[PDB]
Design a protein around this ligand. Structure first.
Ligand SMILES: CCN1c2ccccc2C(=O)N(C)c2cnc(Nc3ccc(C(=O)N4CCC(N5CCN(C)CC5)CC4)cc3OC)nc21
Length: 123
């Protein structure tokens, strides 16, 4: 019922660790990960356990911080833009599937505000 999760390693994808990617893991990801509202975003949406039979009919580019964390740890990304895009996709999916005022949308907005503050200080 769930799709395979996004890959976190790919032996054919060139790997890199720039100073910006280092900041993305050690400052940006870590700051969001320890936030009180991180828990919905620390693993893929489990549409089986959450009883969301239409989630992966609507969301075709799933992303979550657990995936992002592993990608960063594995040096999966070539540049910071790829990682920033993954964060943006995660938030966007939440806004697509849910509705204004839903608790989960308010949590995403709080996390996104923090993300934006930290990205503004990228090396
Ligand atoms: C969260 C809402 N939601 C969605 C729901 C419907 C549709 C889309 C989404 C969605 O867009 N996203 C990103 C989500 C991604 N992932 C999850 N995962 C999880 C959801 C619930 C639990 C859970 O039952 N508990 C137990 C209760 C606990 N409460 C703490 C707050 N306290 C006041 C009261 C107790 C929180 C954890 C655990 C989860 O995973 C660890 N839910 C998501």
């Amino acid at each position: 019922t769930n799709p395979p999760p996004p890959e976190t390693s790919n032996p054919n994808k060139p790997k890199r660790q720039t100073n910006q990617l280092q900041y993305l893991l050690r400052v940006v990801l870590k700051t969001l990960w320890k936030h009180q509202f991180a828990w919905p975003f620390q693993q893929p949406v489990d549409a089986v356990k959450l009883n969301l039979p239409d989630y992966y009919k609507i969301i075709k580019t799933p992303m979550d911080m657990g995936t992002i964390k592993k990608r960063l740890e594995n040096n999966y990304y070539w540049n910071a833009q790829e990682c920033i895009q993954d964060f943006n996709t995660m938030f966007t999916n939440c806004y697509i599937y849910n509705k204004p005022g839903d608790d989960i949308v308010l949590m995403a907005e709080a996390l996104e505000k923090l993300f934006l503050q930290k990205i503004n200080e990228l090396p």
